[PDB]
Design a protein around this nucleic acid. Structure first.
Ligand code: MG
Ligand code: MG
Ligand code: MG
Ligand code: MG
Ligand code: MG
Ligand code: MG
Ligand code: MG
Ligand code: MG
Ligand code: MG
Ligand code: MG
Ligand code: MG
Ligand code: MG
Ligand code: MG
Ligand code: MG
Ligand code: MG
Ligand code: MG
Ligand code: MG
Ligand code: MG
Ligand code: MG
Ligand code: MG
Ligand code: MG
Ligand code: MG
Ligand code: MG
Ligand code: MG
Ligand code: MG
Ligand code: MG
Ligand code: MG
Ligand code: MG
Ligand code: MG
Ligand code: MG
Ligand code: MG
Ligand code: MG
Ligand code: MG
Ligand code: MG
Ligand code: MG
Ligand code: MG
Ligand code: MG
Ligand code: MG
Ligand code: MG
Ligand code: MG
Ligand code: MG
Ligand code: MG
Ligand code: MG
Ligand code: MG
Ligand code: MG
Ligand code: MG
Ligand code: MG
Ligand code: MG
Ligand code: MG
Ligand code: MG
Ligand code: MG
Ligand code: MG
Ligand code: MG
Ligand code: MG
Ligand code: MG
Ligand code: MG
Ligand code: MG
Ligand code: MG
Ligand code: MG
Ligand code: MG
Ligand code: MG
Ligand code: ZN
Lengths: 50, 155, 60, 208
RNA sequence: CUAAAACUCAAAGGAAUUGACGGGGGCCCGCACAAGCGGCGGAGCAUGUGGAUUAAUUCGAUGCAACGCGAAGAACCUUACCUGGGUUUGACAUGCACAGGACGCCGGCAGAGAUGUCGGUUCCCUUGUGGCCUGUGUGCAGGUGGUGCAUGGCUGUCGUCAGCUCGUGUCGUGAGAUGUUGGGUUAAGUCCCGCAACGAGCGCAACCCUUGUCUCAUGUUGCCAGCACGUUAUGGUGGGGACUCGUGAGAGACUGCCGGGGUCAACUCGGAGGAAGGUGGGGAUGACGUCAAGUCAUCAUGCCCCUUAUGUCCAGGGCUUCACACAUGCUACAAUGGCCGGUACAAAGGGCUGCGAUGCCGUGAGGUGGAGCGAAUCCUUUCAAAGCCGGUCUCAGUUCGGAUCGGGGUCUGCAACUCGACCCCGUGAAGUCGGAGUCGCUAGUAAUCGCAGAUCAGCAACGCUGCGGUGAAUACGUUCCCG
RNA sequence: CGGCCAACUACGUGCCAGCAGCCGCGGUAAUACGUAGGGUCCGAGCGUUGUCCGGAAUUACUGGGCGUAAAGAGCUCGUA
């Protein structure tokens, strides 16, 4: 709602976008795995290893 | 309308017969946006009328349309605190539209216990001159001829 | 919001059915989102200040 | 309501979020602790105006950046205010906290700093006429800034009324998204109540 | 005709400027009217409000611009109201002292329950104490107690209407005027023409998102052109970018060109190309100000008020009371239909103390169990309904219509009698298109039919927000009604 | 001790009790009411009331006007 205490005819809409990317690595070389482990990424980007 | 005349939609022709009048009739009888159901109603009523009368459905359709289409209409306007009725001629397109509208409205209010039957009987009565649409047009022309004294207003 | 009551709500209730939201910043009982833990006006303020990581104006 | 927040309006293009991280399960915990720490710092620090506060979080580690016109009192030559703030953060349990103090290049080109100065001058004794005149002159002195305006509302001079008046010099194209506008406000103290101040600063344009 | 006094007032007057107003005129725009569609006002039901009761039915709002409103959720808490039992530097923080090493935690007994009494553990530092609370206070905490005619912040309306101002100059003495006037044109103070005016600012337009086409990059959990294995289960499996698919970059509408009108100027009509032609469709976007507009019940704040209470715990009750009135929606009033059986097409979104597969039993709510999932993979049924085919009803207060009242169960909850929802049954009331009057709508629009989410354990969800299927009629033209 | 008019702060009742030469001041937060201090003027005097002159070009001889504000008789003939 735009404002408190009634006044409901007007509202606001908000959005939250999250981008998901897949990096399918083949031939998991241990050197590559260690590099991925010790490479630092910005907090805005989350890395999941599975 | 204030800026000027708006464009008119390009109505498409009926493939089953080839008459835009059938398309106009189905569009007018459309209720709650059921196009296929309305078309089925129209086809069934037309077939029933055809089998009752033993003639050409399109031919009788144009016969009824020409019999019931009007020529004059009454308009209302107030001058000097008094409300008067002024008649004015009507163009053929609006005449046909009003004829179809009257046909549908007076088919609505019959007592044959079945609408697919009521529509066909109303079409037959309009064709033969015993229709409620014919009576409505009679009354309209009577009123126009009675109140055409105020034609000098020309509005 | 009465601070006595907000602290009381924060305190563990004697029963499981006596727990509710109580927006943290202002302690508004009504109209509070579960995910953010904030109410309508608090969410408005944080989003407009841009201090909430992920909220933005929506126009599609 | 007349105008929406310029910062929120241009959050998607010109300005960026004051904090960035990713958290879902503990998002409520993170936001509540962030608001707690921000209110604590706001209450604790008044003498030195803090232009902006930025928090950077990664796993347990949390990084906080503070921008001030002058760090002389914000961080003492021995670390009095520094370790007081560190103790406050530890009490609020921010885990390990790193303090970074940055000084703004141009104090008069920042909306918040001019707002603080105008607010405190209005509070103490200064007349709003002279305050606005001097603030506008100082702000326009710098070459980078192009257009500015200042507005104040509340009880002016102790009169039993409310006055809303402003001065504008330059260009303030709010409706243009490309324009870069810095928005800031503060609430000044006074014996007769409270009065608010608002300022808009236009600084060039951004292409890209 | 000649013509007084008593008394009373602090003004009565002449000219001229800016607004406002006219049942004055002139020139123009809006679903304003006119032509059409579908509704309200009549019955039942679901919500809000007024009125009257009650010990309380907590508080605010009050034509436009309040009345499916703060409440995106009232058995307890919610709750700020009523009754009754306690309580006190206090439920909750902090400084000064006077007595401390325990506060703090796990169980027994009494009790409407708070709460009171007992059972067990007890300081980490180090000689000064810090953290802590147990008693006396000191300051003080505490207040949804008052004041939106004292204020901050936030928001609606005039109105997404196109208008509101400043610098220099000029005229008048002066309030002031010109710029902003006249002609043309546009959705617009958008632009051209001469003029004592020359320039600029806020507004308008553009810069943002989505949607319509194409090119490049692009293959898993997605798609299948061309090859093999499935053999009833479907790309299911080996394989592959030849098109969607999802998400990055670019091109594309600029009166771009032609003919006529136009001051040779704006602008306008028609035509060619093209996905679209003359702001392609929609959204975000509220200038100076008006309504002393709404909000001390989000929050913050000046002053007054309570402090042994108007702070505070707990049990029960209330916010759902009723002889009435108004407002917003749902169900209908039946054959373009109800019911029964067969039968094909979508989008988007959610899932951790949560979704819940298969199987078994229940008419069915649901009971057992629980694979697959922090999620293009598993569930929300292969996302359906209207739609298409077959049978009954023959115009009835009806096989339409479903409220009210009785008799049995499931589920969440310590807690369903005031006071939930759902399932099973009996129950068959008013209602046959509706008075003056009044509301919505000009293309994927009107109407009709479905799906998902926020608040949430259970729901008063017919509300709000979003995503969809089928898909109309009409506009002669501004005389009259409103702005 | 509001502006004319050199001289300000608090306390007490709020359209009541009251001030005032003109303008005007109090409808819970008065430099205008009453009281406190503090300040200004005056002083063996300080204020109020009454009368006369000037500012009054406001009876305009020196020194005013008659279209619209108050003011040209309804128009002519004619004595002093
Ligand atoms: Mg609850
Ligand atoms: Mg809430
Ligand atoms: Mg006059
Ligand atoms: Mg007038
Ligand atoms: Mg329109
Ligand atoms: Mg009409
Ligand atoms: Mg109705
Ligand atoms: Mg009704
Ligand atoms: Mg309802
Ligand atoms: Mg009420
Ligand atoms: Mg109403
Ligand atoms: Mg009402
Ligand atoms: Mg509503
Ligand atoms: Mg209770
Ligand atoms: Mg209060
Ligand atoms: Mg109180
Ligand atoms: Mg109150
Ligand atoms: Mg009010
Ligand atoms: Mg206007
Ligand atoms: Mg001059
Ligand atoms: Mg003029
Ligand atoms: Mg001009
Ligand atoms: Mg103008
Ligand atoms: Mg003018
Ligand atoms: Mg303009
Ligand atoms: Mg614009
Ligand atoms: Mg394939
Ligand atoms: Mg305005
Ligand atoms: Mg008000
Ligand atoms: Mg008011
Ligand atoms: Mg406040
Ligand atoms: Mg109380
Ligand atoms: Mg209640
Ligand atoms: Mg109620
Ligand atoms: Mg229905
Ligand atoms: Mg079926
Ligand atoms: Mg079963
Ligand atoms: Mg199915
Ligand atoms: Mg029934
Ligand atoms: Mg039914
Ligand atoms: Mg009936
Ligand atoms: Mg009947
Ligand atoms: Mg009628
Ligand atoms: Mg619910
Ligand atoms: Mg739809
Ligand atoms: Mg004075
Ligand atoms: Mg003086
Ligand atoms: Mg006196
Ligand atoms: Mg007083
Ligand atoms: Mg006095
Ligand atoms: Mg004195
Ligand atoms: Mg003497
Ligand atoms: Mg004299
Ligand atoms: Mg003199
Ligand atoms: Mg004289
Ligand atoms: Mg005179
Ligand atoms: Mg004369
Ligand atoms: Mg006169
Ligand atoms: Mg005369
Ligand atoms: Mg004369
Ligand atoms: Mg003579
Ligand atoms: Zn809040």
């Amino acid at each position: 709602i735009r404002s408190p205490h009634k006044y409901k005819d007007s509202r606001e809409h908000f959005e939250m976008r999250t981008h998901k990317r897949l990096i399918d690595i083949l031939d998991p070389t241990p050197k590559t795995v260690d590099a991925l482990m010790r490479i630092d990424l910005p907090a805005s980007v989350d890395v999941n290893i599975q | 309308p204030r800026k000027g005349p708006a464009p008119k939609r390009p109505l498409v022709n009926d493939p089953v017969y080839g008459s835009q009048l059938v398309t106009q009739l189905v569009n007018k009888v459309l209720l709650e946006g059921k196009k296929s159901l309305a078309e089925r109603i129209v086809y069934g009523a037309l077939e029933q009328a055809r089998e009752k009368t033993g003639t050409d459905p399109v031919v009788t359709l144009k016969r009824a349309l020409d019999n019931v289409k009007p020529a004059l209409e009454v308009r209302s306007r107030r001058v000097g605190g008094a409300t008067y009725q002024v008649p004015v001629e009507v163009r053929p397109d609006r005449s046909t539209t009003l004829a179809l509208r009257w046909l549908v409205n007076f088919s609505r209010q019959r007592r044959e216990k079945t609408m697919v039957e009521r529509l066909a009987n109303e079409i037959l009565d309009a064709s033969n001159g015993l229709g409620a649409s014919v009576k409505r047009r009679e009354d309209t022309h009577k009123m126009a001829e009675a109140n055409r004294a105020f034609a000098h207003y020309r509005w | 919001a009465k601070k006595a009551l907000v602290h009381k709500a924060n305190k563990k209730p004697k029963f499981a059915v006596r727990a509710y939201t109580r927006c943290n910043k202002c302690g508004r009982p009504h109209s509070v989102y579960r995910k953010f833990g904030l109410c309508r006006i608090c969410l408005r303020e944080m989003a407009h200040a841009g201090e909430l990581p992920g909220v933005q104006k929506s126009s599609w | 309501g007349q105008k929406i927040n310029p910062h929120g309006f241009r959050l998607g293009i010109t300005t960026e979020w004051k904090s960035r991280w990713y958290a879902d399960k503990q998002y409520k915990d993170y936001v509540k602790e962030d608001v707690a720490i921000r209110k604590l710092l706001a209450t604790g620090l008044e003498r030195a105006g803090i232009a902006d506060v930025e928090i950077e979080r990664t796993r347990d580690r949390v990084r906080v950046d503070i921008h001030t016109a002058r760090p002389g009192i914000v961080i003492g030559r021995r670390g009095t205010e520094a370790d007081r703030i560190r103790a406050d953060l530890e009490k609020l349990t921010g885990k390990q906290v790193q303090l970074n103090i940055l000084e703004v290049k141009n104090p008069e080109s920042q909306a918040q700093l001019v707002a603080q100065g105008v607010a405190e001058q209005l509070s103490n004794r200064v007349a709003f006429r002279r305050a606005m005149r001097k603030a506008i002159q100082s702000a326009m002195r710098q070459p980078n800034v192009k257009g500015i305006r200042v507005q104040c509302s509340g009880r002016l001079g102790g009169a039993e009324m409310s006055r809303s008046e402003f001065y504008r010099e330059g260009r303030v194209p709010l409706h243009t998204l490309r324009a870069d506008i810095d928005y800031g406000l503060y609430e000044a103290k006074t014996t007769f109540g409270r009065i608010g101040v608002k300022v808009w600063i236009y600084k060039g344009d951004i292409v890209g």
